[PDB]
């Protein structure tokens with residue numbers, strides 16, 4: 001994953017979304033970079049650096065943590081995505097950026113980042129369509145199941161929006177998010193998603209490596225079987 005000179009293809013985008021681990025320092029009681037390393041070794045296919053709120057790091061300390069997480073992703077051969085912070089993404093030469101409905105407007109972010117990967121969180125059909133017309137490479141849909149990791153979430157929607165987007169014939173890359181565990185991931189893939197994303201199911205696991213590996217095995221099975 002080098003410096004891109006073309007938009008990512010939908011085929012490659014959908015492969016990367018399979019097991020999409022998201023983490024910051026306030027999401028684990030263990031050493032944060034160690035947790036990221038273990039998730040990548042077990043099989044996460046994409047990583048998002050999300051360091052915000054709670055007792056998150058700030059300043060130089062947050063930047064130095066991001067550089068260590070990015071180096072972990074380079075050693076594993078997995079792309080590094082930054083949540084929210086367009087300037088950090090550009091300064092680190094991240095592989096991409098994830099934004100939501102209250103963040104910078106997708107059209108302006110797509111202008112600022114060239115051919116980097118762009119993800120948008122969406123909760124409704126118009127928001128998916130808008131994200132696609134704005135130049136997103138994928139959408140994050142949810143919350144599928146109840147979750148407390150992110151404070152301010154929208155209402156729990158199950159797989160309803162995923163099915164509705166596939167019914168309207170839209171083929172954009174989709175990752176499901178919100179309260180996903182190894183026990184409830186399969187239906188997200190059966191409804192038509194290209195992957196699952198998680199924080200707690202991996203970051204707070206007794207054994208994050210084995211948790212990542214089990215997700216990778218299960219998601220592969222269900223993508224072939226739907």
Ligand SMILES: Cc1ncc(C[n+]2csc(CCOP(=O)(O)O)c2C)c(N)n1
Nearest residue numbers: 121140147149150177178179198199200
């Ligand atoms: C790919 C992507 N889609 C959406 C979001 C926003 N988001 C929605 S629910 C949630 C918490 C999940 O934690 P848990 O797995 O512990 O329930 C997050 C961070 C994002 N940052 N990235």
Ligand SMILES: [Mg+2]
Nearest residue numbers: 084099100103
């Ligand atoms: Mg955001």
